[PDB]
Every structure is written in C-alpha cells, then in structure tokens.
Short mmCIF file of C-alpha atoms and ligand atoms in Angstrom, two decimals:
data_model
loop_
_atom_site.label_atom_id
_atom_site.label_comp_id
_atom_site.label_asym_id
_atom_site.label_seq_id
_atom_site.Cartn_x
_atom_site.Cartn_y
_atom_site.Cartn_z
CA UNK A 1 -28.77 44.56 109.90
CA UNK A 2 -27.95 48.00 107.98
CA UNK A 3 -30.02 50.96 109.11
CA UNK A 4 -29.16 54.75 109.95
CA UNK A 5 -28.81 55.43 113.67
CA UNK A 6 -28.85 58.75 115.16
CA UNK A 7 -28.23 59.63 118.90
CA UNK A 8 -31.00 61.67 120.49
CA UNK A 9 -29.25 63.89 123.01
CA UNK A 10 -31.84 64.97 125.87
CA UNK A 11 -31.75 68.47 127.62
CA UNK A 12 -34.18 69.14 130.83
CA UNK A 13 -37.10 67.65 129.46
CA UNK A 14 -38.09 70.15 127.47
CA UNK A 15 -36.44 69.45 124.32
CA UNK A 16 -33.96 66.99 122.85
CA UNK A 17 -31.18 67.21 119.87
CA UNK A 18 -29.37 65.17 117.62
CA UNK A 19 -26.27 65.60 115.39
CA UNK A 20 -26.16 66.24 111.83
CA UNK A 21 -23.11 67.64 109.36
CA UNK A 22 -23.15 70.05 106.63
CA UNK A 23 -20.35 70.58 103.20
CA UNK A 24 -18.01 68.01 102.71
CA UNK A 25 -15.69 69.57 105.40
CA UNK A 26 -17.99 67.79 107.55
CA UNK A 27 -19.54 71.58 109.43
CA UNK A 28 -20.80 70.05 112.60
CA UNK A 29 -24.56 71.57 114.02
CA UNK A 30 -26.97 70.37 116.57
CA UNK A 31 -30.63 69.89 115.31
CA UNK A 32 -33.94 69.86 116.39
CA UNK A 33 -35.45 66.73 114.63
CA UNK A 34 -39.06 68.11 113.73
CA UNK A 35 -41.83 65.84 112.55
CA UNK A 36 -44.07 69.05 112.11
CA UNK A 37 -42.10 70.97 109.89
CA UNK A 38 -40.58 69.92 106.61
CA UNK A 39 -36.91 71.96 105.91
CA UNK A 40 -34.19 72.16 106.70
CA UNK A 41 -32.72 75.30 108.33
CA UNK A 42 -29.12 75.80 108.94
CA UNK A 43 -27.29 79.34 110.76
CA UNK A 44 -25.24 80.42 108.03
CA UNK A 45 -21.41 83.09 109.04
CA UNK A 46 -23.27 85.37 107.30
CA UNK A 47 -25.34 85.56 110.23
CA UNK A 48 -24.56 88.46 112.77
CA UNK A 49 -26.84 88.82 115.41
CA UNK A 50 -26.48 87.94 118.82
CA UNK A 51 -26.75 84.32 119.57
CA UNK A 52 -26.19 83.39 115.89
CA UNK A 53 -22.30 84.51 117.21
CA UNK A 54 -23.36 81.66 120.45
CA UNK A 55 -24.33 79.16 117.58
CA UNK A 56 -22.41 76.64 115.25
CA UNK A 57 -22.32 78.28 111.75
CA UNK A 58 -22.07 77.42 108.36
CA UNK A 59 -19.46 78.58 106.03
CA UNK A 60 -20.37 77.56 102.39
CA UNK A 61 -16.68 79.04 101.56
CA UNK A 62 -15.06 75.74 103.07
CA UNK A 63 -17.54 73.42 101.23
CA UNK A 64 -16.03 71.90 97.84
CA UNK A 65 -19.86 71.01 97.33
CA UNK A 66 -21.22 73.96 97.88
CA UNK A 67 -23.78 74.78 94.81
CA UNK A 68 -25.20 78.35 95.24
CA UNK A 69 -29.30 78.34 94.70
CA UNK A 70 -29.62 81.78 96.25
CA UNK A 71 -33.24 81.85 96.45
CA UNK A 72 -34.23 84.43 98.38
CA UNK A 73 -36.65 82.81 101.67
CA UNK A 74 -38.63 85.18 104.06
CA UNK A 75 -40.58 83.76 106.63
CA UNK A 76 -42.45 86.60 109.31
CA UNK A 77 -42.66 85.09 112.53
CA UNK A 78 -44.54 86.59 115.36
CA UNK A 79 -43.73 90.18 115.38
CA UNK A 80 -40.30 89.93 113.71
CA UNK A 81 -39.07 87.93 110.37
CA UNK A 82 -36.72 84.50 109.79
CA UNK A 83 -34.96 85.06 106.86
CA UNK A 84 -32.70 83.34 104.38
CA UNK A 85 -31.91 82.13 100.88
CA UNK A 86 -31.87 78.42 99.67
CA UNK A 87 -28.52 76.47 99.14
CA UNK A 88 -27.85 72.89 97.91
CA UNK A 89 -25.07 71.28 99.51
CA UNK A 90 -23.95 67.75 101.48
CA UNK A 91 -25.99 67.01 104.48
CA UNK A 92 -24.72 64.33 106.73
CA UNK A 93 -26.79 62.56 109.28
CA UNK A 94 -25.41 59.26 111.17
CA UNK A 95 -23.56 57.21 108.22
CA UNK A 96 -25.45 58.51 105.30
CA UNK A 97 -24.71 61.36 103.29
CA UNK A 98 -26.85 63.03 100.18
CA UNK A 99 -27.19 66.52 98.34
CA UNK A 100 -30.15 68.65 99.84
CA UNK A 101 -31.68 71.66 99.34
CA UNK A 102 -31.41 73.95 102.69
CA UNK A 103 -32.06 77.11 103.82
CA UNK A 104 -29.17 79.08 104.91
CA UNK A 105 -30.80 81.51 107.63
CA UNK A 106 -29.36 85.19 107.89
CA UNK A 107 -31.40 86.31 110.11
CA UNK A 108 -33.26 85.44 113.15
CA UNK A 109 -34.78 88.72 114.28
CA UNK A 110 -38.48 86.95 115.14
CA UNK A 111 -37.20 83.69 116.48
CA UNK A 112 -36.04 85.10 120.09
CA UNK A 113 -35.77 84.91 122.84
CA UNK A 114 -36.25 81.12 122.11
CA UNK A 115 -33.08 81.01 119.61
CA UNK A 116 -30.39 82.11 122.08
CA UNK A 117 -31.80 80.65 125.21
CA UNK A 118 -31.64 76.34 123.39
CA UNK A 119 -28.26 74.92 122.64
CA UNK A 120 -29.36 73.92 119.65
CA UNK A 121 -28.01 75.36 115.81
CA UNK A 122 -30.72 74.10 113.22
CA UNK A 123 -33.86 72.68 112.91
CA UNK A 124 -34.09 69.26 110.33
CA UNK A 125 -38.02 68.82 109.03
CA UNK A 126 -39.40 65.23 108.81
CA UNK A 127 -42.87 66.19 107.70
CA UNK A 128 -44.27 65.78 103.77
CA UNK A 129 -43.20 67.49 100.65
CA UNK A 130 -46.51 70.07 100.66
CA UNK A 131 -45.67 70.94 103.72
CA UNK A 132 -42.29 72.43 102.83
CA UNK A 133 -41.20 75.75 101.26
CA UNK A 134 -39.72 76.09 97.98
CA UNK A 135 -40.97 72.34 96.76
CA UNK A 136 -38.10 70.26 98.73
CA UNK A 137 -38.45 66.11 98.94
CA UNK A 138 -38.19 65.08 102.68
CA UNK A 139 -34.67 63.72 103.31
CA UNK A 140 -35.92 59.90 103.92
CA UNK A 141 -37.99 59.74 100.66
CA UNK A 142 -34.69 61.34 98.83
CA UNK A 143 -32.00 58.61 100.33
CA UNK A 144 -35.16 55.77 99.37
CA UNK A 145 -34.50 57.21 95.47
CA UNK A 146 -30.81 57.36 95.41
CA UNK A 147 -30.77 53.26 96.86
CA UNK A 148 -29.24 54.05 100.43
CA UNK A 149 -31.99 52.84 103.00
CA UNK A 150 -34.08 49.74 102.38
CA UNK A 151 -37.39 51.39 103.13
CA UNK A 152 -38.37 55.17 102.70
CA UNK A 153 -38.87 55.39 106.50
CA UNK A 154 -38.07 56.44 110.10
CA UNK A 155 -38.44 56.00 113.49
CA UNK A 156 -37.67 57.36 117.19
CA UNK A 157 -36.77 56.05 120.33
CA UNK A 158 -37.11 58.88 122.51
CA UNK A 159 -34.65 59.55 125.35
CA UNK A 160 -35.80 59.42 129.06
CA UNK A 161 -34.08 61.59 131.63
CA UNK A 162 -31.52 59.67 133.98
CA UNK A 163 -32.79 56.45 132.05
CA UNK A 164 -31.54 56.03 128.51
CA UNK A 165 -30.29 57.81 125.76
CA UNK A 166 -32.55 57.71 122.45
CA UNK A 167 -32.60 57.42 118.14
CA UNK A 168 -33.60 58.12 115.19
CA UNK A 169 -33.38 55.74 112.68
CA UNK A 170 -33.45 55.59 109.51
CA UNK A 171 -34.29 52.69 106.71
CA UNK A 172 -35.74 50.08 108.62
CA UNK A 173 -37.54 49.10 111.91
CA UNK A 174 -35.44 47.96 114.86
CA UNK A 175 -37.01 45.29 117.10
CA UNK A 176 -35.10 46.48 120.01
CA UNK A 177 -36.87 49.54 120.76
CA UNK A 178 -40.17 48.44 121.51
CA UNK A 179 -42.28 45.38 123.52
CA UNK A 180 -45.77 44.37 122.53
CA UNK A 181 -47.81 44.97 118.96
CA UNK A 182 -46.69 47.51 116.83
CA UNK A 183 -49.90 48.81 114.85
CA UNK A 184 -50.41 50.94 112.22
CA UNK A 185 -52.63 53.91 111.89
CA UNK A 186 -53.28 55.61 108.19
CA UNK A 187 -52.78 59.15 107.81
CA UNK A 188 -55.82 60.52 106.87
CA UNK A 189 -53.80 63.51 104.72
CA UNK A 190 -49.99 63.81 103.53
CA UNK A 191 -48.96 66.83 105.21
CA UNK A 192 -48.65 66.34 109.30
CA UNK A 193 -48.14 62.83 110.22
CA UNK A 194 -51.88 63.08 111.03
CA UNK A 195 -54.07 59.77 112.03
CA UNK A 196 -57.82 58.83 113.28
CA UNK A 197 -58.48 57.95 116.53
CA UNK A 198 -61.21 57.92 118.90
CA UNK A 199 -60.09 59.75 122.20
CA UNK A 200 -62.09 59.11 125.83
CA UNK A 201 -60.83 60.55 128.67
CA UNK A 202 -63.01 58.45 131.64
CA UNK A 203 -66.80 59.95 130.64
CA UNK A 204 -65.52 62.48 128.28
CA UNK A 205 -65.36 61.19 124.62
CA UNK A 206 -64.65 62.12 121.38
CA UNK A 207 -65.23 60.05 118.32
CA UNK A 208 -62.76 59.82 114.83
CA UNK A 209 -60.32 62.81 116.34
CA UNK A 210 -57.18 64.39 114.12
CA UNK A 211 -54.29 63.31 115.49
CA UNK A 212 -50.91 64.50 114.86
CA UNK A 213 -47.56 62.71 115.74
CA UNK A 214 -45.08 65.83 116.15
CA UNK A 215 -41.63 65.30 117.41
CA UNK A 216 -41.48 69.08 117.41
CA UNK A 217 -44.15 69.84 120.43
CA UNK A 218 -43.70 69.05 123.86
CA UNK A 219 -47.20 69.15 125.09
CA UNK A 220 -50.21 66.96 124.82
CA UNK A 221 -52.22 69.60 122.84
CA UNK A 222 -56.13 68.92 123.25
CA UNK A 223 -59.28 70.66 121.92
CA UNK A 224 -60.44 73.25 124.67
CA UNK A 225 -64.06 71.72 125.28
CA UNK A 226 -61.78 68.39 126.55
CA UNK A 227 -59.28 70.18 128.56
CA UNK A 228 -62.46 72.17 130.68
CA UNK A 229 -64.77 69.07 130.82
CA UNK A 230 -61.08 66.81 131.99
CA UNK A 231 -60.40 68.94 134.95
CA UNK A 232 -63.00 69.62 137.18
CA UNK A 233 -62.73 68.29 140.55
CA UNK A 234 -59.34 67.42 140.27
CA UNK A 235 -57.72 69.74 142.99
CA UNK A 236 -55.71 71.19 140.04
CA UNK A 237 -54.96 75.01 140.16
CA UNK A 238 -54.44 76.86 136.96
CA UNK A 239 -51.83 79.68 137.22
CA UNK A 240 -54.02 83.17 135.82
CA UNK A 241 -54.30 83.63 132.01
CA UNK A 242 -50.94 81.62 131.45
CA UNK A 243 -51.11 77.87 130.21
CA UNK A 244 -50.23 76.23 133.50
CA UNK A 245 -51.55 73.83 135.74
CA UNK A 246 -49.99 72.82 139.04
CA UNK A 247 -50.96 69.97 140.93
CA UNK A 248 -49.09 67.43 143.91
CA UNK A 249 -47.04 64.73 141.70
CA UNK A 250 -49.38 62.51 143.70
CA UNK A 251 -52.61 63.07 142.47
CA UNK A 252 -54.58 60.15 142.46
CA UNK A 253 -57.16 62.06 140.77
CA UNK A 254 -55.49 62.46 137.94
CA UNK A 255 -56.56 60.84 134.38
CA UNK A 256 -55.56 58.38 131.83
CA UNK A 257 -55.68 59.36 128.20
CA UNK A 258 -57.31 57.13 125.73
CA UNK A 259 -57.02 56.57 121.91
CA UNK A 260 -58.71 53.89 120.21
CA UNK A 261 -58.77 52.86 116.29
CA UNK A 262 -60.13 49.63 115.46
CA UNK A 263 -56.55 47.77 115.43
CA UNK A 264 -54.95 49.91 118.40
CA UNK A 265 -55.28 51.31 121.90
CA UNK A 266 -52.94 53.57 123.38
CA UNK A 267 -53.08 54.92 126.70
CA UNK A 268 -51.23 57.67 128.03
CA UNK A 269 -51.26 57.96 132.09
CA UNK A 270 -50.50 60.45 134.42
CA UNK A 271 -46.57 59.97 135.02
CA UNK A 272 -45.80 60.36 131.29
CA UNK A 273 -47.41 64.20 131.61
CA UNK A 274 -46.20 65.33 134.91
CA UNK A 275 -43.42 67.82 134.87
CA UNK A 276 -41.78 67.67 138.21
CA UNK A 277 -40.92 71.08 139.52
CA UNK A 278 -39.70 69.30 142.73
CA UNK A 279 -39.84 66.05 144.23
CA UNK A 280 -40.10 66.69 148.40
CA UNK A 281 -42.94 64.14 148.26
CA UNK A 282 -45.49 64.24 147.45
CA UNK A 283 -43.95 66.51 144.61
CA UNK A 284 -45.08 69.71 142.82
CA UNK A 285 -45.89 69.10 139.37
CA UNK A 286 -47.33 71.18 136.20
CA UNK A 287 -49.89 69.66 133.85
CA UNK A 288 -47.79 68.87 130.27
CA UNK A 289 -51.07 69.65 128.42
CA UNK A 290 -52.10 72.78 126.63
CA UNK A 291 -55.66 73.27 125.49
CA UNK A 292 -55.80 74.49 121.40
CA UNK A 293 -58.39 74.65 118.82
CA UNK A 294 -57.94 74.13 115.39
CA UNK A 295 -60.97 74.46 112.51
CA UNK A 296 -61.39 70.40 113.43
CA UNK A 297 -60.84 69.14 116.77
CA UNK A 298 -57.24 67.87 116.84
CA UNK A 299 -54.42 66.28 119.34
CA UNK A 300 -50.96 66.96 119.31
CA UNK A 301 -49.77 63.73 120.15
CA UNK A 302 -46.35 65.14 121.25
CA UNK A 303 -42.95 64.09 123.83
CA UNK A 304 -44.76 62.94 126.28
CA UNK A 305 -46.77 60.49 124.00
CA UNK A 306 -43.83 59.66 121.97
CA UNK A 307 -41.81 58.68 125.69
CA UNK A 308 -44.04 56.34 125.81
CA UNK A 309 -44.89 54.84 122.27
CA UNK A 310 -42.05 54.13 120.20
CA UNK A 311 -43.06 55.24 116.80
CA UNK A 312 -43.01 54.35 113.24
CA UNK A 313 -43.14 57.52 110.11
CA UNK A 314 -43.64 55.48 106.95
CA UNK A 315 -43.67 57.29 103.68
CA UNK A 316 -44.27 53.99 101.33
CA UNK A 317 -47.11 52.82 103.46
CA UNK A 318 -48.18 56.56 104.25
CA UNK A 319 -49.03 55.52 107.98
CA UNK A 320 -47.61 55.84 111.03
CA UNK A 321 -46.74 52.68 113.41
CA UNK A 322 -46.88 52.72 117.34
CA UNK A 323 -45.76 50.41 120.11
CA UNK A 324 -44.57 50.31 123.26
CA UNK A 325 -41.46 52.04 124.10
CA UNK A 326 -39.26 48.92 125.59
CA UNK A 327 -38.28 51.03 129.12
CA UNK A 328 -34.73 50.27 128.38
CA UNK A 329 -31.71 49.83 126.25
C1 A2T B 401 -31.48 78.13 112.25
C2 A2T B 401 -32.79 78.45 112.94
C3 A2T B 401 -33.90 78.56 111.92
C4 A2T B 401 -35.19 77.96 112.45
C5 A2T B 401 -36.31 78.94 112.12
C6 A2T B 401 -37.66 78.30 112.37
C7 A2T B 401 -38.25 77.51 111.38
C8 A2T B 401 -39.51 76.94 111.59
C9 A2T B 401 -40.17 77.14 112.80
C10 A2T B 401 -41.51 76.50 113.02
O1 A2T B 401 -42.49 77.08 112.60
N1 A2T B 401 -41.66 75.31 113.62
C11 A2T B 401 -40.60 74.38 114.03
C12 A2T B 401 -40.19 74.51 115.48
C13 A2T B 401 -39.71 73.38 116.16
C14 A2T B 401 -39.32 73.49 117.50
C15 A2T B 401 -39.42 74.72 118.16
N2 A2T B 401 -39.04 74.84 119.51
C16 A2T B 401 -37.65 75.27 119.60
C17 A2T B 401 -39.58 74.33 120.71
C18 A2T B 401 -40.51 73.28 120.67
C19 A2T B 401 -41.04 72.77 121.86
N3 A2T B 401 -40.66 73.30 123.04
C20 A2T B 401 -39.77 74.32 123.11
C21 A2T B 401 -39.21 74.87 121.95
C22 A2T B 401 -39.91 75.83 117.49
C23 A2T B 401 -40.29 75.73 116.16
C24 A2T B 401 -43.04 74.88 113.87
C25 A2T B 401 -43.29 74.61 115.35
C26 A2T B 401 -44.78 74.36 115.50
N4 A2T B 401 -45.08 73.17 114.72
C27 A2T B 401 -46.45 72.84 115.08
C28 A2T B 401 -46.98 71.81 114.09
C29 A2T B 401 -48.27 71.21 114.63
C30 A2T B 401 -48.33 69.72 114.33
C31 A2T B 401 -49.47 71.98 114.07
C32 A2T B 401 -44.91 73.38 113.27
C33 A2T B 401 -43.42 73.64 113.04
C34 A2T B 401 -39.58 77.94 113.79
C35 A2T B 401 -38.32 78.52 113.58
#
C-alpha cells in the first residue's frame, strides 16, 4: 500500500501522544501532534529547569547531522517566556526520515505547571507555513517535495479509551479507518485547518460558521451566545466562574450538535462530549465544551469531534476530509 503510520498513544482522555526521533542517533521524544500550531519544538540538555530534568532531551552533541542555525526564538507565554534558538537536524517520524528546521527550547519558565504535570517531551505542528515562526514548510508538504509520500497529506484515527489504539498517517488515505462518505470541506484560509459550516443546535442556529479542525484542543469550543441559548433547561449546573458544567451521564436532555455544508452533515451527540467523573449510574459527568469568542464566530472542532470523525488534512487539495470513525480496528 505504502503510507506512514504513526501510533497514537492515549492518556486519560485528556490528551494523547505519539512517537517521533530526533539526530541520526535516533534521540527518542514523545509528541503532542498539533493541528493548531505549526513547529516543531523539541527540550534540548541545555535545558535545566525542573521537569525539563523529568523530560526526554536532546543532545545535538551525539547527532552527526546536527547543523547549528542558532537563531535566537522567544516566545512570552502567559506571565512567563518559552524560549529557544532554531536548529536543523534529522527528524524521524514512523518510517520516514527528512532534515527540518526545529526549535531547540531552553527554557520553559511560562509553560507550567502544564509542562511537568503531561508525559509528554515536544510538541510537532501540523498547521500551514504562515502560521509558523521563522518561515518553516510543514513536515508533510516537505516529505511531498523530496518524493517520499504519494500525496502531500495526513490523517488521524484517534484512539478511544479501553477500545482501540489510534494513527497518524501520512501520504495517503487508508480505507480502514472509516465507514460511510468521506466529504470534503474547503478551507476558507491557509492558516488553521479552518472550514464553513452551518451549525444548529435543535432551535438555535447559526449560518456559514468558522470552523477549525485542531488536534491540539480537547474541547468543543463554541461562540458564547450558543453555549447560553444551548443550556437552559437542561438541569445542568455550572461550577462558579470556572469553565465547568456537571450534569448525570444520563441526561436525556442533553443535545446533538449539528454541522451542515452543502455536501456534508456531521453530528456530534451527547456521549462523544461527556467526561465521566464516575460511572455509579446514572454517572456524574462534566460538559467537554467551553464557550469562546473570537472577532468571527468560530468552533473548535476538537477530540471529541475528531473521536468521532475520522479526518482528512490535505495540503494539495487545501481541504479537509471527514467520515465516520469505523468504531474499531
Ligand atoms: C518542548 C516544549 C515546548 C512547547 C512550547 C509551546 C509551544 C506552543 C504552544 C501553543 O501555543 N500551542 C500548542 C499547544 C498544544 C497543546 C497544549 N496542551 C498541552 C494541552 C492541550 C489540550 N489539553 C490539555 C493540554 C498546549 C499548547 C497552541 C495551543 C492553542 N492552539 C489553539 C489554536 C486554535 C485553533 C485557535 C494553538 C496552538 C504552547 C507551548
């Protein structure tokens, strides 16, 4: 068949990981595969602050293909800065290897507690070249160039707790991981992987919405004026001034997304957004959907979407492709 394939690793379904190598030494790191951010960021030795001394770290010393690009990268995160310099060296991921610019990270005095508390080293971009710093091609488009994949595109295949392991892969479609149509939606910009749909939630509506496909979010993210109108009446308490909603993993009350485009419709129902704090039937659950405004209204079509809908990332036909997750592998 050919194609890329890349374990996705799933840990308490908040977050899930897959394996990628660094220098020809073969420097082994767990990533966070990001569709919403386009670098990639790697813990270099260098590194000495608690939980960088937890993490995997890279050692340029031990690469023969190490090729020094010291660019100096600062990045001020909330209330404390990410910072690093640029290197070029042999990135790894499944069976395919290429030359990349990366950003070594020396610090990560702005990225905590959140750093320390994962398991995971890195975080690999997916997004669009304007979307990156310094002015680095995504890794897809790069092995498309050099003749290594058939098509300059990805996919995932997400895991599902207790169920199934999941991939991404790269190069080509694989009919396994899905049942049913696969569509494809446009992006209506080359930055996010950011579509057009119309979203209806029972009553409420919303015509020609910005959607965004993001690997890197686990929430449904919707516009504030559709979380209010969505919840009244639906014995649904919201835990003061913090973004949390508890409710009885029962709820029959509870809605069904909607997103329609003229060649699609994809629904996302109540069990696909329920995070089970425990299941002594009828359950206590929390709400997996924040509400957030941006200058147009906008989805972040996130985990719990992508658990459902397999998905398709497609730089040549800049569009992104969505079917039904086949339940099992
Ligand atoms: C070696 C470590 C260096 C990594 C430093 C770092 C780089 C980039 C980001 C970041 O902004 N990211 C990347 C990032 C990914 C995952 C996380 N975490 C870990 C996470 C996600 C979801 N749940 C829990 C934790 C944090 C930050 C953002 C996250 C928000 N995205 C929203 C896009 C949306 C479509 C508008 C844009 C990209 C953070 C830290």
């Amino acid at each position: 068949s050919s194609n890329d394939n890349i374990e996705l690793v799933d840990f308490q379904n908040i977050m899930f990981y897959g394996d990628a190598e660094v220098g020809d030494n073969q420097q082994p790191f767990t990533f966070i595969l990001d569709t919403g951010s386009a670098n990639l960021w790697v813990p270099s030795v260098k590194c000495t602050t608690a939980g960088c001394l937890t993490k995997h770290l890279y050692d340029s010393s031990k690469s023969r293909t190490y090729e020094k690009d010291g660019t100096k990268v600062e990045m001020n995160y909330v209330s404390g800065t990410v910072s690093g310099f640029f290197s070029k060296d042999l990135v790894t991921v499944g069976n395919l290897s290429l030359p990349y610019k990366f950003i070594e990270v020396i610090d990560t005095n702005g990225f905590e507690p959140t750093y320390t508390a994962s398991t995971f080293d890195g975080i690999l971009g997916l997004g669009w070249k304007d979307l990156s710093i310094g002015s680095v091609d995504p890794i897809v488009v790069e092995l498309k160039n050099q003749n290594k994949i058939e098509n300059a595109l990805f996919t995932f295949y997400l895991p599902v707790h207790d169920k199934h392991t999941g991939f991404l892969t790269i190069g080509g479609i694989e009919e396994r991981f899905y049942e049913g149509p696969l569509t494809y939606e446009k992006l209506n910009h080359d930055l996010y992987w950011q579509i057009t749909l119309d979203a209806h939630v029972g009553n409420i509506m919303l015509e020609k919405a910005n959607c965004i496909v993001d690997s890197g979010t686990s929430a449904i993210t919707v516009p504030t004026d559709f979380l209010n109108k969505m919840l009244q009446n639906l014995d649904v308490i919201k835990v003061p001034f913090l973004p949390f909603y508890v409710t009885l993993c029962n709820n029959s009350k509870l809605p069904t997304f909607e997103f329609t485009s003229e060649n699609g419709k994809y629904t996302l129902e109540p069990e696909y957004y329920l995070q089970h704090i425990e299941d002594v039937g009828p359950g206590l659950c929390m709400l997996n959907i924040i509400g957030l405004d941006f200058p147009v209204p906008t989805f972040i079509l996130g985990d719990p979407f992508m658990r459902k809908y397999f998905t398709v990332f497609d730089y040549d036909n800049h569009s992104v492709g969505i079917a039904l997750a086949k339940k099992n592998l």
